[PDB]
Design a protein around this nucleic acid. Structure first.
Ligand SMILES: [Mg+2]
Ligand SMILES: [Mg+2]
Ligand SMILES: [Mg+2]
Ligand SMILES: [Mg+2]
Ligand SMILES: [Mg+2]
Ligand SMILES: [Mg+2]
Ligand SMILES: [Mg+2]
Ligand SMILES: [Mg+2]
Ligand SMILES: [Mg+2]
Ligand SMILES: [Mg+2]
Ligand SMILES: [Mg+2]
Ligand SMILES: [Mg+2]
Ligand SMILES: [Mg+2]
Ligand SMILES: [Mg+2]
Ligand SMILES: [Mg+2]
Ligand SMILES: [Mg+2]
Ligand SMILES: [Mg+2]
Ligand SMILES: [Mg+2]
Ligand SMILES: [Mg+2]
Ligand SMILES: [Mg+2]
Ligand SMILES: [Mg+2]
Ligand SMILES: [Mg+2]
Ligand SMILES: [Mg+2]
Ligand SMILES: [Mg+2]
Ligand SMILES: [Mg+2]
Ligand SMILES: [Mg+2]
Ligand SMILES: [Mg+2]
Ligand SMILES: [Mg+2]
Ligand SMILES: [Mg+2]
Ligand SMILES: [Mg+2]
Ligand SMILES: [Mg+2]
Lengths: 68, 229, 197, 125, 54, 145
RNA sequence: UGAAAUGAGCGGAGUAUUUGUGCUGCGCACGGCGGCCGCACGCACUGGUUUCUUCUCCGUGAUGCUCCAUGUUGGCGAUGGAAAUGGGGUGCCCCCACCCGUCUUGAAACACGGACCAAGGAGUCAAACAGACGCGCAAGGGAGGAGAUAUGCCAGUACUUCUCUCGUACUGAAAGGGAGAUGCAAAAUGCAUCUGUGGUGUGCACACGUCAAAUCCGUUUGAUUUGCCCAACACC
RNA sequence: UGCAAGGCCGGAAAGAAAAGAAUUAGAGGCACCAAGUGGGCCUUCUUCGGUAAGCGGAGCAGGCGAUGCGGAAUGAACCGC
RNA sequence: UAAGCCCAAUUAGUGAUUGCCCAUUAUUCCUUUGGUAAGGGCGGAAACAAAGGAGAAAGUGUAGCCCUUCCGAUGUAGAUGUGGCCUGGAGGUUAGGACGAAGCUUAUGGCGUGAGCCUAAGAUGGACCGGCCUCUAGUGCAGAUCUUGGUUGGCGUA
């Protein structure tokens, strides 16, 4: 026998029971994979240099603190 | 006999008692001065407006009154069969039960919200007597998430911790004149819970203009609330 | 009636008592509930909550990790001050990958025999919580630590391994069975390794 | 001995909660059972039907478990059990078990008279 | 529903369970301590019989 | 070694001194002044304890556990008998000398013992008067040997 | 029924304060005209006057952690086959009230099963896997089979080696290969040290300061600066 | 020494003025394990097929189903709650 | 001369503001129960014989350690909790019985919201058995055109 085909009667109520959650903020999950490659490669070189600078900065802080 | 730790407890308690009595006497004097100041301000404002109206009439002009700044809103319908948009607004006004009542500012953002839920509310412009009666008779504060009746001025001072709100007359003045601490005072109070109006209503399903009850009824709201408080 | 629709969704599930059957755990809970109620330190409150927690949420810690974090704190501490006491609400286990360690004072619910021997041989002391309550009632000059929870096999198994961007392990006993279709491009399709979120 | 005075007993409800339609079938006991029928008028709370138990009928905690005499019952089986009630004799009254024989009951009653301990099911005196 | 579980291979589709129509195919170890005692007793008796040989 | 706090955790739910009848929890511990099943009143468990007991005649006896020989059951409890007419405050002071937190309950128990002794004499006399008017038919005597 | 009376009400002492009305001073404000004229009596000077109107000021912590315990006048009750108050039983009056279980959007139904009672009557046992919770040990955990002697009451308990199994390392179809940090440097297996988070952002507690509110003046409750950041998340 | 990108150092910050110039019975985020259900029906506004139907098919919302109570004499869905 | 229809009032050109009746709703008072619950007390202050009294546990859950305060409470399918109730057997512990155990009968009351527990009487019976902490299972019936036994209106009828 025939039956109901389709309806959207109760769906809005179901979606709002646990609410419609907002988006993740922009500073999270901001991966750069798939972007324009030439700019991606150049940015990798700068980040490698910055890590070496960070290590050097900590050593100087330790030596200065020990000297009081 | 009492020994060791039982002595300094007695001495510290003795100093606590006298300090409590001194603080209570100081607060009573402060509340007396502020109440006297407010009453003189209210009388002076009324006499000023009376003279201004007389001057305009004697020369054929008109005097335009200032637009109302405060409204009092009460819910007059149950909780059944409410659309989602109306349901959301009534929750943001804290009107979750029939015959709950609140004070709101009568500005443009609030006016458009009251328009969307008109069939559920009756509102108007309160008077000094109405504000005073609600605070003294139906006034409750939110203390640690509990609904606590106001019974002395020390309770008010501890709740707000502001030098401008120390007594019950300070709360009345802020609400009635829409002072700079209007939001702080009203947000700190539990929503008012009132009784049904003695003598009945006309028709809750029609606007006041049509002979019903809901909508804006101006200063006639005070007669309505006088039978509910 | 009052319109309180969806008000039960703001309730939170918190344990108020322990499920343990250990009388010594019960004694420690009694002592630190008293301390948390009657003092003004956050250390006692945190210790009380962690004592209430369950075994799976009290992951063990490594002696090498303790040593590393203690050194990183000590490099920026004046030489006229004493090193803090490491405090773990859980178990401390030995580490064969690190042989040389400094003298440290550690308090924990339980020590393995190897860890106790290593600490004593290095020249430190192993303390219990009842001793700690007398040495530092308010937790002054301490270092609260937790063990690692990520890296467990159950955590590695959580999720569906057949959706794009997922790298969870499937539940299977035969390692060589669930290859081919759905995991290689040559067999119909391959699950995508990456997906933007 | 006189029991300690308490506030008046209220007893929110005195009638028992009996099973639906137990009067029409001899085999059905009057012990309460929760009706789970889909069309049951008792479950659906019709106006003229029987009521159902819930938490609102609970008794005042100040006067709970107190017998009309003003004491609370504590079962006893021999003479030595009386010494538990010596200090708190204004709060608890002893109840002798059904299976205690007549020979032993004579010793329990005689001892309780001297200690001034009330027996719920004593004899005369 | 089924959810996320291991795909089962329990291998119990033959008539192994003894029932009203099947003899079954099972082996239990309820005689293990008795057999252990019997073996030790037999070893002691054999040693006594073949004394003094190892 | 093994403290009172540890032992109370072990025996709180199950002990031969715990009488849980009906819904009431009582204690038949001989060294309990109240009959309540609490850690404070469990005299068999505490390091120090004191209890008020009646004596022959109309006297009141105080049994004290000093906590110096808890590993020798034969020498654990020592009795100090006081003759009749002793003030109830004097008895409480003897108890308070070993455990100050039992002073109030021991005072009330001392008065209760005195009232029982006087009532027993009055009841026994009345019963004997009734028994003298009854012929009876049998009476047994224990052999003196 | 005063076993804490917090009182404009109880107690004590004064019998005068100060709220309003009326009248009125200066300056400002307000209205009209084009600075002068008006001010119904607005703000400041807590402006003056006392003609009317009104009471004013002090006082009792818990050395009580909690529960129970206290007036007046009559009727009934003087130990009985007594009185009283609760239960229990049967009838009656006024009001209320469709037959249970079930499938179903919808049952009371002209939808099915339903004469009465007793006894019986339906999510169990085993194996593989996973999650939550309890317990032991921990880079290790644990057998199983079997033996040995207490042991010849005892199908239990006590003891034991190698081994076996899961794990400490993964990856490729396979032949195969196989994971530290820092510094100098740039070697087709580079060299040197070994008390050490590979880096960045956000991140308990603790340590050093500062600011608020409250305070029985001992200290508390919140914020924030800096350091290290544990667990954890994101990007490399 | 211009633009792009990643960092370091320093300053300022009604922490968001005034003009009707928001409000909240306003603690955010993240996981693990699992049930029932997958025949619906009615009403308000908008509608498609049909002469029409207590007929068939859809959009938004509220209900009955799963719910009594007080009203419309009586009624699953109407009015009040 | 409505007890009908359309308007309009509240005791009526006299004096200014609510005629009356009926809810599982609103306000308020008493009691219960559960919290994402909020606070206080818990070193026995001193003193006190019969011929003012008792209690006072550092605590999820009880006959709740005690006291104060605020808020919520209906519900099919379904999920979870309970120092929640009941039945046959096992390891412990503590009792009862020929001056009468189990079983059976009830206008026998008492207790608990309830599952149920306890006492009384037998003008019943004649030999075993109760409470508490753990362990264990062939562990709770109103209906399946359910199984077996007995009974029964139709009926002194065809
Ligand atoms: Mg369908
Ligand atoms: Mg009406
Ligand atoms: Mg409507
Ligand atoms: Mg790992
Ligand atoms: Mg009852
Ligand atoms: Mg239904
Ligand atoms: Mg499904
Ligand atoms: Mg004392
Ligand atoms: Mg006076
Ligand atoms: Mg019916
Ligand atoms: Mg049908
Ligand atoms: Mg039906
Ligand atoms: Mg029909
Ligand atoms: Mg059918
Ligand atoms: Mg191995
Ligand atoms: Mg070898
Ligand atoms: Mg691995
Ligand atoms: Mg390989
Ligand atoms: Mg390959
Ligand atoms: Mg603004
Ligand atoms: Mg179906
Ligand atoms: Mg159809
Ligand atoms: Mg259905
Ligand atoms: Mg309805
Ligand atoms: Mg009609
Ligand atoms: Mg309540
Ligand atoms: Mg419910
Ligand atoms: Mg059986
Ligand atoms: Mg009968
Ligand atoms: Mg069965
Ligand atoms: Mg049956």
């Amino acid at each position: 026998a025939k039956s109901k085909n389709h309806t959207n009667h109760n769906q809005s109520s179901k979606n709002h029971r646990n609410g419609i959650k907002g988006p993740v903020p922009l500073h999270l999950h901001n991966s750069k994979r798939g972007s324009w490659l030439p700019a991606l490669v150049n940015a990798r070189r700068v980040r490698k240099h910055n890590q070496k600078a960070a290590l050097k900065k900590r050593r100087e802080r330790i030596a200065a603190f020990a000297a009081k | 006999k009492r020994a060791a730790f039982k002595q300094q407890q007695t001495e510290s308690f003795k100093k606590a008692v006298v300090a409590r009595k001194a603080a209570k006497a100081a607060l009573k004097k402060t509340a007396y001065l502020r109440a006297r100041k407010y009453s003189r301000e209210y009388r002076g404002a009324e006499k000023k407006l009376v003279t201004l109206r007389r001057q305009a009439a004697s020369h054929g002009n008109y005097y335009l009154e200032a637009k109302p700044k405060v409204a009092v809103v009460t819910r007059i319908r149950g909780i059944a069969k409410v659309n989602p948009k109306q349901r959301k607004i009534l929750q943001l006004l804290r009107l979750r039960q029939i015959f709950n009542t609140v004070f709101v500012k009568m500005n443009k953002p609030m006016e458009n919200m009251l328009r969307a839920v008109e069939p559920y509310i009756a509102y108007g412009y309160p008077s000094l007597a109405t504000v005073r009666a609600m605070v003294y008779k139906r006034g409750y504060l939110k203390i640690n998430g509990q609904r606590v009746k106001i019974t002395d001025n020390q309770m008010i001072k501890d709740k707000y911790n502001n030098v401008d709100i120390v007594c019950a007359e300070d709360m009345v003045n802020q609400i009635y004149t829409c002072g700079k601490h209007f939001r702080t005072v009203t947000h700190g109070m539990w929503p008012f819970k009132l009784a049904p109006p003695a003598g009945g209503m006309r028709q809750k399903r029609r606007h006041f203009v049509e002979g019903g009850d809901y909508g804006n009824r101006d200063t006639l709201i005070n007669r309505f609330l006088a039978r509910m408080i | 009636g009052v319109d309180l629709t969806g008000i039960s969704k703001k309730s939170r599930v918190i344990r108020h008592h322990t499920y343990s059957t250990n009388p010594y755990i019960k004694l420690l809970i009694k002592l630190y509930k008293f301390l948390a109620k009657r003092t003004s330190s956050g250390f006692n409150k945190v210790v009380y909550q962690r004592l209430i927690k369950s075994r799976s949420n009290r992951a063990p810690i490594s002696l090498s990790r303790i040593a590393v974090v203690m050194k990183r704190k000590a490099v920026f501490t004046a030489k006229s001050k004493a090193a803090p006491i490491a405090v773990v609400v859980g178990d401390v286990l030995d580490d064969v990958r690190m042989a040389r360690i400094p003298a440290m004072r550690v308090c924990a619910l339980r020590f393995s025999k190897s860890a106790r021997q290593s600490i004593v041989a290095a020249g430190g002391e192993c303390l219990t919580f009842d001793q700690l309550a007398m040495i530092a009632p308010t937790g002054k000059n301490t270092y609260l630590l937790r063990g690692r929870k990520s890296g467990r096999e159950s955590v590695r198994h959580f999720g569906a391994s057949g959706v794009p961007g997922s790298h969870s392990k499937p539940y299977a006993t035969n390692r060589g069975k669930e290859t081919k279709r759905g995991r290689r491009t040559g067999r119909s399709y391959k699950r995508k390794a990456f997906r933007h979120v | 001995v006189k029991p300690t005075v308490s506030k008046a007993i209220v007893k929110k409800r005195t009638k028992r909660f009996t099973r639906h339609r137990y009067e029409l079938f001899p085999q059905l006991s009057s012990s309460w059972r929760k009706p789970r029928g889909e069309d049951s008028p008792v479950r659906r709370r019709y106006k003229g039907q029987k009521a159902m138990p819930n938490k609102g009928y609970g008794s005042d905690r100040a006067t709970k478990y107190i017998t009309p005499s003003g004491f609370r019952n504590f079962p006893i089986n021999n003479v030595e059990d009386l010494y538990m009630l010596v200090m708190q004799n204004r709060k608890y009254a002893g109840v002798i078990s059904h299976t205690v024989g007549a020979r032993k009951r004579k010793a329990i009653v005689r001892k309780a008279m001297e200690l001034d301990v009330r027996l719920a099911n004593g004899n005369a005196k | 529903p089924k959810g996320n579980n291991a795909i089962p291979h329990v291998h119990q589709k033959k008539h192994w369970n003894p029932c009203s129509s099947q003899k079954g195919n099972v082996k239990v170890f309820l005689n293990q301590p008795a057999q252990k005692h019997r073996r030790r007793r037999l070893r002691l008796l054999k040693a006594k019989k073949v004394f003094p040989r190892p | 070694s093994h403290s009172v706090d540890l032992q109370w955790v072990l025996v709180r739910q199950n002990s031969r001194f715990l009488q849980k009848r009906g819904g009431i929890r009582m204690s038949n511990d001989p060294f309990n002044n109240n009959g309540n099943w609490t850690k404070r009143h469990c005299g068999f468990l505490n390091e120090k304890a004191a209890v008020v007991k009646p004596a022959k005649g109309g006297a009141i006896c105080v049994t004290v556990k000093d906590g110096s020989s808890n590993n020798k059951p034969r020498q654990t409890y020592k009795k100090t008998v006081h003759a009749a007419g002793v003030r109830a405050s004097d008895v409480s002071r003897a108890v308070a000398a070993v455990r100050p937190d039992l002073a109030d309950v021991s005072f009330r128990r001392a008065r209760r013992m005195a009232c029982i002794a006087s009532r027993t004499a009055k009841v026994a006399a009345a019963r004997k008067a009734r028994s003298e008017k009854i012929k009876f038919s049998r009476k047994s005597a224990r052999a003196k040997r």
